[PDB]
Write a protein that holds these residues in place. Structure first.
Motif, PDB file in Angstrom:
ATOM      1  N   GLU B  30      34.060 -39.877  14.845  1.00 28.82           N
ATOM      2  CA  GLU B  30      35.309 -40.098  14.141  1.00 28.82           C
ATOM      3  C   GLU B  30      36.308 -40.764  15.070  1.00 28.82           C
ATOM      4  OE1 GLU B  30      37.262 -36.202  13.042  1.00 28.82           O
ATOM      5  OE2 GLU B  30      38.503 -36.970  14.679  1.00 28.82           O
ATOM      6  N   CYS B  31      37.094 -41.673  14.513  1.00 28.87           N
ATOM      7  CA  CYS B  31      38.093 -42.382  15.286  1.00 28.87           C
ATOM      8  C   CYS B  31      39.150 -41.421  15.757  1.00 28.87           C
ATOM      9  CB  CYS B  31      38.749 -43.452  14.445  1.00 28.87           C
ATOM     10  SG  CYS B  31      40.106 -44.263  15.243  1.00 28.87           S
ATOM     11  N   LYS B  32      39.476 -41.491  17.039  1.00 30.59           N
ATOM     12  CA  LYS B  32      40.413 -40.548  17.622  1.00 30.59           C
ATOM     13  C   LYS B  32      41.783 -40.604  16.980  1.00 30.59           C
ATOM     14  CE  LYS B  32      37.673 -38.561  20.310  1.00 30.59           C
ATOM     15  NZ  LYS B  32      37.418 -38.829  21.727  1.00 30.59           N
ATOM     16  N   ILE B  33      42.139 -41.729  16.372  1.00 40.50           N
ATOM     17  CA  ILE B  33      43.460 -41.946  15.812  1.00 40.50           C
ATOM     18  C   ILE B  33      43.523 -41.731  14.314  1.00 40.50           C
ATOM     19  CG2 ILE B  33      45.037 -43.910  15.360  1.00 40.50           C
ATOM     20  CD1 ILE B  33      45.199 -42.521  18.247  1.00 40.50           C
ATOM     21  N   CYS B  34      42.409 -41.698  13.639  1.00 41.89           N
ATOM     22  CA  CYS B  34      42.459 -41.593  12.191  1.00 41.89           C
ATOM     23  C   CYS B  34      41.289 -40.816  11.623  1.00 41.89           C
ATOM     24  CB  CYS B  34      42.482 -42.972  11.573  1.00 41.89           C
ATOM     25  SG  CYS B  34      40.935 -43.822  11.622  1.00 41.89           S
ATOM     26  N   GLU B  35      40.461 -40.165  12.434  1.00 42.48           N
ATOM     27  CA  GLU B  35      39.383 -39.326  11.929  1.00 42.48           C
ATOM     28  C   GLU B  35      38.368 -39.992  10.994  1.00 42.48           C
ATOM     29  OE1 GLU B  35      42.878 -37.802  11.200  1.00 42.48           O
ATOM     30  OE2 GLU B  35      42.765 -37.614  13.384  1.00 42.48           O
ATOM     31  N   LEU B  56      38.355 -45.721  19.444  1.00 44.89           N
ATOM     32  CA  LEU B  56      38.979 -46.168  18.210  1.00 44.89           C
ATOM     33  C   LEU B  56      37.952 -46.818  17.325  1.00 44.89           C
ATOM     34  CD1 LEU B  56      42.148 -48.066  19.328  1.00 44.89           C
ATOM     35  CD2 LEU B  56      42.033 -45.713  18.708  1.00 44.89           C
ATOM     36  N   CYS B  57      38.241 -46.854  16.041  1.00 46.41           N
ATOM     37  CA  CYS B  57      37.482 -47.701  15.149  1.00 46.41           C
ATOM     38  C   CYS B  57      38.098 -49.078  15.151  1.00 46.41           C
ATOM     39  CB  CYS B  57      37.444 -47.101  13.752  1.00 46.41           C
ATOM     40  SG  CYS B  57      38.961 -47.103  12.847  1.00 46.41           S
ATOM     41  N   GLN B  58      37.420 -50.017  14.503  1.00 43.40           N
ATOM     42  CA  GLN B  58      37.852 -51.403  14.598  1.00 43.40           C
ATOM     43  C   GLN B  58      39.145 -51.657  13.852  1.00 43.40           C
ATOM     44  OE1 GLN B  58      34.893 -54.402  14.109  1.00 43.40           O
ATOM     45  NE2 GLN B  58      33.549 -53.506  15.649  1.00 43.40           N
ATOM     46  N   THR B  59      39.371 -50.983  12.732  1.00 41.26           N
ATOM     47  CA  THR B  59      40.647 -51.120  12.046  1.00 41.26           C
ATOM     48  C   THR B  59      41.800 -50.678  12.926  1.00 41.26           C
ATOM     49  OG1 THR B  59      39.438 -50.582  10.030  1.00 41.26           O
ATOM     50  CG2 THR B  59      41.792 -50.763   9.876  1.00 41.26           C
ATOM     51  N   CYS B  60      41.636 -49.588  13.659  1.00 38.52           N
ATOM     52  CA  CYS B  60      42.689 -49.148  14.556  1.00 38.52           C
ATOM     53  C   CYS B  60      42.801 -50.025  15.782  1.00 38.52           C
ATOM     54  CB  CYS B  60      42.458 -47.697  14.948  1.00 38.52           C
ATOM     55  SG  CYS B  60      42.359 -46.670  13.530  1.00 38.52           S
ATOM     56  N   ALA B  61      41.725 -50.686  16.172  1.00 39.15           N
ATOM     57  CA  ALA B  61      41.837 -51.704  17.202  1.00 39.15           C
ATOM     58  C   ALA B  61      42.565 -52.929  16.678  1.00 39.15           C
ATOM     59  CB  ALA B  61      40.449 -52.076  17.707  1.00 39.15           C
TER      60      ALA B  61
END
Ligand SMILES: [Mg+2]
Ligand SMILES: [Mg+2]
Ligand SMILES: [Mg+2]
Ligand SMILES: [Mg+2]
Ligand SMILES: [Zn+2]
Ligand SMILES: [Zn+2]
Ligand SMILES: [Zn+2]
Lengths: 48, 257, 93, 49, 97, 126, 34, 312
Positions: B30-35, B56-61
């Motif tokens: 899970e992305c650390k910023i948005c699960e 991070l996931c790519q959207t959060c990147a």
RNA sequence: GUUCUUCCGAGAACAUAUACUAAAAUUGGAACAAUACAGAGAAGAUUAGCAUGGCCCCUGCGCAAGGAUGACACGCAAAUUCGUGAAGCG
RNA sequence: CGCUUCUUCGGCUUAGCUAAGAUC
């Protein structure tokens, strides 16, 4: 082993649901350890 | 859920060895910023490094133009708080769960209409060329590889590292826990709030010397120096003419070879 | 309207933008969204709201009247002409 | 100028249950922007109507 | 017995586990219509069809709130049929009636 | 391959002007020989240099510590072996340690005292 | 008492729909808060 | 609509089914089909036209097929590999007509004599050129060079054997003398392929120095035999034996390249005429269709690309 | 480390890159049992049952079915706008 | 010619179904 596994594995499912007032004994009888509230007896009603 | 062929990463996270082995695990974290669960990539950047992986996931990147592991900006290599400061990008990104999950969904829809090579609009289209220069002139140019070394060995901090020289983890002094650089949060570093290393950069960048015009508003004269000695090393009057009539109408140019 | 009354104009804007996602054919929402901007002297916001309204519902006279009137009261009368000209391009009633 | 990397696929454990909760619910994406309404001009109602 | 119960429990324990780990997504699954629920479902789809006919039938430029009154006239027209009362509303528009 | 004519943006950096496919570069699939790929990893890791992976590498034939690549073109410790398989207690086959092998590592008392206060300051949060 | 089952709507703008781009520069408008 | 140049079903065709690095590929001289092989050891045949269906697949090598050539009458396919063996495959039968089991190391290249009695020149990691005559188990000629030989061809009269290898110099062996009559010196690094012009006047020779040099192999030459140098392609760390080939009109030359691009040079000007993309690894072998302007390219990516080119 | 080379202490071949690397140290997040109080849908009461809605769950193998109809809903509903004459003034 | 008070004119917006759901 398969009995140890299966016994452990059902116990984890009980504990995963925090139903710590149920007890699975070693012959796999599922005993309520205390008289159950309507909440507890609803919540702990495992299915088939 | 989101998936891709390759992670959004900076070169210091990948290491100097241009040949790499990497593992892909779809939805593996899970992305650390948005699960949100996201395709995870794991690699070792050269010998002596630890296994790093995408955080991070790519959207959060994309929604911050940041490296998926170190979360520094992909252009300047700076923390978000430094870059969002200089570009005047406010703390606009929602942070509350259902609110920012909704926001990220629209980001992913919007970027899905693009070519895939751009971050969100705010940073894809910022044009303050003076702010870009300020960032360029403070971003670290060399890749800092020390941030991929193993963790410090807690059993060595306990004084009892029972593995000896077989221990992969580092046998050396921790960072002192009073130094604020020891106390960092992924959310602080991502959204760019209260980031210790950002403040240590911004302060030293602000403390750099600068030109500023004098109070003598009648003065319009600039001294120019470091022109070298007379002869073939000297700049001609034409050289200053061509460089400086770019900006404004010279009234007079005086050369002192 | 309430977010405007508390001075939270940016919140008020987003609420009207979310209202228009529910019913974009509601003339009341476009006018109340427009009127609150020009109450707040947000003339460039208000102009953008009207250009959207007349773009999306060209047959609703209320937008053309309110928009051209606003541009007249604000003394941008060549702006008002171009609004009437753009209206007449729809061969209106 | 270039890296070249071997991407292996990490082996899934077949005995591992679903990893993450997906009972989350969030609002729908907003609709695509309004298509202009493109009507015939209004037909005047008399008060008789 | 175990031959056939094995895939059945594999599916069932899968569904048990998956909602135990993923949670229960089942909000907004289509509830089907069954013995007791038929008679309330007929009234939904009747009133929805009636309402759609109302809104299409009324000309453009009418306050739509009249439509909810027409649904009351429908319910009275049914009760009068049920109770064999003669139903006649004196001012009701003939397309509506 | 005819180049794009005209000036180039002052505003965009060379990173931003670069040909790209993802947010950070041009990803594209590749098919190397598996054997030679492994050889080049291990040369970079162990020696500090490797042959250049780029297509159209031009003059830059070697990457990394190129000084070693040009110079060289491309001792071990001893182990306390006891392969006496009948020696039930004593045998050490593959598990022969180095004779040097520092099987436990402990910091000096100077480093201990510094690190003792660190865990205490961490624990004093309570 | 702490609450966490929902967004606090007063913390940040909920589900913020940003106003589209238009031909008139919105930043020329200067508003003074009430 | 757009211009067309051939009976191909589309201006570019992608042929898929190989399971490993395709080291070699050749057209039948009659133009009907093409044969391709490599690390997957199977030899795949493809029609040049229509669906390009993989109408046959020969098997039998116990090693990678390093090189593969048709006999000039198209009745047989010669192939050689890392199983130390040259094999001749009968086309109508699909069967191993001969198996020259006499090399002592990997056979890197093979070339059948153009006319007269069928002879098969072969070069090998044992350092020897050998010429095998179909009628005898024993080779006609064994030319022991000191270092591993990677490429071979006859001259057009089929009475000189030209070879190259780790020593970078091309040998030319004269089959009536059993001597090297002359050598062609100029490559900076090991040769990866040699190919003989249709007229036989010239050879090209590809090398890991990333140049193709054109050599004049005519009996009399009034001076230097080096005709010219082509550049643009690249050889990577895989050190594949990148082949080279001639256009059937000799106006154009090709060579394999590690940079993924299919290179064509014009023989007269030495300019690159095509640098076609589309492969994803080393383009190991390239050839021209003998009657029609079609390009074959075989990749390390397990893909074969067929496509039209404007041979103006 | 093994099968072989010999001028003899070296050389050829075989063998070729494990590990979410921790015995840890840190850091969020759910429900628990009950002193006294007042106590659970529908124009009087006893009050069915079934529907409807969303950023609300729980039990259940479940498009079955239960959880009080599972709970909620429970009115400033104005949301495109006027038109009139007397009498004070000034 | 203008402001204010007042009345006065068009407008001035019932939350399903079931055996009235069942019973007195
Ligand atoms: Mg009830
Ligand atoms: Mg129910
Ligand atoms: Mg019930
Ligand atoms: Mg309910
Ligand atoms: Zn994320
Ligand atoms: Zn990074
Ligand atoms: Zn350690």
């Amino acid at each position: 082993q398969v009995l140890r596994q299966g016994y452990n594995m059902l116990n984890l499912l009980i504990h995963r649901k925090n139903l710590n007032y149920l007890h699975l004994d070693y012959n796999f009888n599922l005993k309520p350890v205390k008289t159950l509230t309507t909440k507890e007896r609803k919540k702990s009603r495992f299915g088939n | 859920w989101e998936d891709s062929d390759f992670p959004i990463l900076c070169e210091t996270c990948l290491g100097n060895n241009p040949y790499m082995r990497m593992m892909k695990d779809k939805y593996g974290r899970e992305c650390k910023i948005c699960e949100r669960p996201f395709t995870t990539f794991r690699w070792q950047p050269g010998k002596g490094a630890r296994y790093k992986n995408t955080e991070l996931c790519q959207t959060c990147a994309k929604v911050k133009n940041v490296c998926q592991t170190c979360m520094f900006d992909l252009e300047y290599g700076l923390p978000v708080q430094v870059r969002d400061h200089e570009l005047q990008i406010a703390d606009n990104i929602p942070k509350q769960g259902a609110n920012r999950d909704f926001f990220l969904q629209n980001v992913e829809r919007t970027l899905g209409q693009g070519d895939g090579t751009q971050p969100i609009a705010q940073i894809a289209n910022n044009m303050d060329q003076a702010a870009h220069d300020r960032l360029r002139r403070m971003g670290r140019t060399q890749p800092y590889y020390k941030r991929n070394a193993p963790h410090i060995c807690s059993f060595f901090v306990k004084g009892e590292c029972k593995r000896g020289e077989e221990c992969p983890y580092r046998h050396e002094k921790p960072t002192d826990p009073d130094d604020p650089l020891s106390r960092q949060n992924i959310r602080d570093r991502y959204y760019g709030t209260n980031d210790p290393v950002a403040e240590k950069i911004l302060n030293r960048a602000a403390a750099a010397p600068t030109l500023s015009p004098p109070a003598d508003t009648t003065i319009t004269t600039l001294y120019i120096g470091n022109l070298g000695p007379s002869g073939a090393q000297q700049v001609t009057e034409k050289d200053l003419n061509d460089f400086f009539y770019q900006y404004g109408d010279i009234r007079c140019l005086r050369v002192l070879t | 309207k309430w977010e405007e009354s508390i001075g939270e104009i940016q919140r008020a804007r987003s609420v009207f933008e979310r209202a228009l996602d529910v019913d974009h054919r509601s003339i009341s929402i476009w006018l109340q969204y427009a009127e609150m901007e020009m109450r707040c002297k947000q003339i460039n916001h208000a102009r953008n709201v009207f250009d959207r309204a007349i773009t999306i519902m060209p047959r609703a006279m209320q937008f053309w009247l309110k928009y051209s009137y606003m541009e007249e009261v604000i003394e941008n009368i060549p702006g008002a002409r171009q609004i009437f000209e753009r209206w007449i391009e729809w061969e209106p009633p | 100028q270039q890296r070249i990397i071997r991407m292996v696929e990490e082996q899934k454990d077949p005995m591992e249950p679903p990893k993450f909760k997906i009972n989350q619910k969030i609002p729908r994406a907003p609709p695509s922007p309004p298509a202009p309404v493109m009507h015939s001009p209004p037909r005047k109602m008399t008060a008789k109507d | 017995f175990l031959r056939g119960i094995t895939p059945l429990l594999e599916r069932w324990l899968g569904n048990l586990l998956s909602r135990q780990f993923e949670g229960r997504h089942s909000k907004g699954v289509a509830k089907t219509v069954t013995k007791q629920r038929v008679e309330s479902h007929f009234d939904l789809e009747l009133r929805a069809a009636v309402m759609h006919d109302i809104l299409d039938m009324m000309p453009d430029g009418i306050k739509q709130n009249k439509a909810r009154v027409i649904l009351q006239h429908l319910s009275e027209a049914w009760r009068c049929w049920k109770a064999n009362i003669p139903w006649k509303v004196p001012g009701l528009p003939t397309p509506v009636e | 391959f005819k180049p794009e004519s005209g000036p180039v943006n002052h505003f965009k950096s060379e990173q931003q002007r670069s040909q790209k496919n993802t947010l950070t570069g041009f990803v594209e699939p590749a098919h190397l020989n598996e054997f030679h790929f492994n050889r080049q990893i291990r040369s970079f890791d162990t020696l500090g240099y490797a042959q250049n992976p780029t297509a159209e590498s031009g003059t830059t034939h070697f990457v990394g510590d190129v000084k070693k690549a040009e110079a060289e073109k491309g001792e071990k410790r001893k182990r306390v072996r006891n392969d006496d398989s009948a020696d039930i207690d004593g045998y050490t086959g593959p598990w022969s340690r180095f004779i040097d092998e520092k099987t436990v590592a402990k910091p000096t008392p100077e480093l201990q005292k510094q690190m003792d206060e660190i865990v205490k300051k961490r624990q004093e949060k309570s | 008492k702490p609450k966490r089952n929902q967004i606090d709507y007063s913390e940040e703008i909920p589900f913020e729909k940003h106003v589209p781009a238009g031909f008139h520069n919105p930043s020329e408008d200067r508003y003074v808060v009430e | 609509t757009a211009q067309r140049f051939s009976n191909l079903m589309a201006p570019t065709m992608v042929l898929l089914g190989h399971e490993g690095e395709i080291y070699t590929g050749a057209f039948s001289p009659d133009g009907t089909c093409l044969a391709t092989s490599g690390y997957d050891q199977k030899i795949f045949f493809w029609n040049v036209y229509g669906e390009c269906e993989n109408f046959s697949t020969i098997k039998g090598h116990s090693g990678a097929v390093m090189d593969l050539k048709f006999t000039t009458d198209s009745s047989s396919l010669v192939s050689c590999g890392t199983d130390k063996s040259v094999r001749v495959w009968d086309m109508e039968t699909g069967t191993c007509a001969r198996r020259f089991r006499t090399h002592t190391d990997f056979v890197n290249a093979v070339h059948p004599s153009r006319r007269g009695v069928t002879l098969v020149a072969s070069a090998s990691d044992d350092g020897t050129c050998r010429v095998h005559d179909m009628r005898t188990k024993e080779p006609v000629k064994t030319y022991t060079n000191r270092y591993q030989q990677t490429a071979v061809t006859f001259n057009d009269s089929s009475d000189q054997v030209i070879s190259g290898g780790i020593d970078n110099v091309l040998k030319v062996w004269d089959m009536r003398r059993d001597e090297i009559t002359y050598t062609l010196t100029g490559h900076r690094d090991t040769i990866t392929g040699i190919s003989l012009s249709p007229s036989g006047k010239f050879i090209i020779s590809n090398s890991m120095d990333c140049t193709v040099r054109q050599w004049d192999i005519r009996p009399f030459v009034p001076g230097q035999r080096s005709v010219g140098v082509f550049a643009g392609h690249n050889h990577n760390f895989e050190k594949n034996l990148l082949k080279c080939s001639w256009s059937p009109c000799e106006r154009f030359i090709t060579a394999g390249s590690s940079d993924r691009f299919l290179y064509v040079w014009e023989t007269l000007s030495k300019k690159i005429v095509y640098k076609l993309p589309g492969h994803m690894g080393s383009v190991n072998c390239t050839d021209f269709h003998p009657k029609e302007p079609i390009m074959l390219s075989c990749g390390s990516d397990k893909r074969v690309f067929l496509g039209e080119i404007d041979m103006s």
